[PDB]
Design a protein around this ligand. Sequence first.
Ligand SMILES: [Mg+2]
Ligand SMILES: [Mg+2]
Ligand SMILES: [Mg+2]
Ligand SMILES: [Mg+2]
Ligand SMILES: [Zn+2]
Ligand SMILES: [Zn+2]
Length: 603
Amino acid sequence: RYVYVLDVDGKPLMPTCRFGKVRRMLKSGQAKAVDTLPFTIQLTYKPRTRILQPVTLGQDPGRTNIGMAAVRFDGKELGRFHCITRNKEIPKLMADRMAARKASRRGERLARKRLARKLHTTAKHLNGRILPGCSEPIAVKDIINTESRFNNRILTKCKVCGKNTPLRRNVRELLLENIVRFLPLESELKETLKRTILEGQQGNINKLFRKLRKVYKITLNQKDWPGKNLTDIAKNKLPGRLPFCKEHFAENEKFTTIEKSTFRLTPTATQLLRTHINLFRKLSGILPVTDVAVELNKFAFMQLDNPEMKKREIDFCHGPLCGTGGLEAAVKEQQDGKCLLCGKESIGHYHHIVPRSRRGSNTIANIAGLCPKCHELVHKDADTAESLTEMKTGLMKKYGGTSVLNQIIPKLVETLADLFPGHFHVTNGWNTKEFREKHHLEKDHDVDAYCIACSHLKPEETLVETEPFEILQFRKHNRAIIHHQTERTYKLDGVTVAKNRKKRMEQKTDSLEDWYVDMAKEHGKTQADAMRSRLTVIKSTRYYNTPGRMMPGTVFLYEGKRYVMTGQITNGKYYRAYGQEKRNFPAVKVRILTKNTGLVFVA
DNA sequence: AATGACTTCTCATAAAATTCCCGGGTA
DNA sequence: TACCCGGGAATTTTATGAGAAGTCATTTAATAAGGCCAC
RNA sequence: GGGCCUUAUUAAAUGACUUCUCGUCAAUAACCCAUGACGAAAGGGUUACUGAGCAGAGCAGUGACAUGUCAUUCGCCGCGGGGUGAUUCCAAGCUCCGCGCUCCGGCUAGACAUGCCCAUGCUUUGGAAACUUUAACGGUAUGUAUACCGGCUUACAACAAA
Ligand SMILES: [Mg+2]
Ligand SMILES: [Mg+2]
Ligand SMILES: [Mg+2]
Ligand SMILES: [Mg+2]
Ligand SMILES: [Zn+2]
Ligand SMILES: [Zn+2]
């Protein structure tokens, strides 16, 4: 591995191979050891020359695995890095934030309800309510509601004004007009075509289509352009909102002259976009980086799901939901409208077969329609649960990770083109493959990153040389006061017999109700009561996080060796460390070097 | 005139339980 | 000179919240047609 | 022919509001059972009533329910200004008050009358900065650590070792 050299200003200089001179300099005060991983030194003097070659920093993007490589202008590797990200956690941490926020608001509602019962201010005969955008009721009970705010929540705004833009359900005429606009038809026939489609008169639509098909030869069929798109705009609802206001949706060319993209991403995609940019900034702290190189990744998911089939024999336009009316309607058609386990009652709940808490997919392969009675048993009884899996197997999330990668790449390219003007370069995955094969390299992230840096360059030799560095990523915040909560465990003779008084929703193990019923079968009531009356109980106990504690990714010294903290034990008395298994490092025997830098180097 | 590749997948932590250590009464 | 208990400090082991309903939104990719600018 | 915009269909993801439920935690009462420290403490349930809602606490600040009758008056939207997150910086997300119809949504919600109460918002998300006393890697001698050596530039190139 090279030694990374810093100037007396703190700015990078070119790396050194001269391991002997580095130890002669450290023995003689000509340098200081700023870091042990990556091993980095700062000069205490200013050299007689200050000449640096161009250094290109290349990246192999990924959700979990990001590759980096530093390549000098002549093609020589100056370092290779593999970063393992934290991005897997964020959807689950957001889904816990979900459950906790809604449970807190349910508690404030329950406090109002219990006060209304005491004062007789509960709603008379209220059995749910229908809101303006809905068709079925919300099942509201004792007090009318709290305002529900879903109809607008503006996020798209007009790309040429900042004004708002209409819903596709209301401006159906403008959407329909911007298709009819371009046709060979006379203006009175364009008016007649729009009006006849907007009236929805199936027979008179066919009369007009047959007339215009004879006179003008235009392909007016409900399965061909334009007639398909015109027929689809006759729907009662259409999804989402326009990119332009009514004043500007009338005109096509504005992308040539004026734009404001008004961009958004989820927390999960935002953290990964930040991670890609922050790896360039971190490695620019140890190398004199002049240029940046990246790989475009672009995934079509129904090709990843059909990899043996060739690209133009895939029905991208159709899939499992085309014209079905959405997921819940497609399942209702697929089941003849009945509950899957018993074929008598109608569908009540759309059941995720692999649960949402257990990495289950939201796609139609993971859904079964059940009545509320069976949906409760499938959560509380393992024999009914296995019986459902024989009818439909279900799926975990196949493509969660690469969907987040697929979202980021366009914004990553724009951001790096702004950060490195005239010094930013792009590749496609097949170029990385060609280079890897041409030079007898083998596939991994840091090697692909070397191939990506070499797209810009003309390497004199294409050798790959160093032991690559490993970077972990750690959380910068954790706001949770409760760390975990125990279940109400019941013990007899010190042995666990049950875990709640009656079953929790997912509880496949016994409650006291389950255990007592089986003891009363085996021993009769008098003995089962003599066993209830002998139970020992630990109440459901909340365990609390220490505020202001050391976070994971903290670097520390113990017995003269560098360690990276992976977690605390016993109110912060002991630290766990990377690669050291269950070993407990005492916090008194430890010096902290740096608090968590987010991206952190490991052995 | 097409399309190639690529990527992905189990814990930190508190506090309860268990062990170990020094000071002591006793012989 | 020497050993078995106790109480406090130190260290290790144990255990970990779920399901659904009425609606909405944003991003990326592909496919189709249109269009602007394009030897 | 390629870039970029827009519409339709689809695929794969992950964000917001509202509403239901199992289970929890606290306490009282009746009932079933276990049990007797030195006649009575200590113990487990079941059913009912009541309270709780990071078993809550911060920082903000007046509303929260109910009935009447008028209804698109309102508002999730525009402009302005605040709360919280939230402090080392700052972001996401939620939210409140004034004025308003340019745009976007709409019996959401608002107004007025009467009754009763404390019944408001946000808080389990994401980066970055800061710290610093961070002697690494290879070969040789010996009893794994102290010692000694890996030419010259921070670096390329040339030169020098060989
Ligand atoms: Mg790649
Ligand atoms: Mg209260
Ligand atoms: Mg379910
Ligand atoms: Mg890769
Ligand atoms: Zn406009
Ligand atoms: Zn059933």
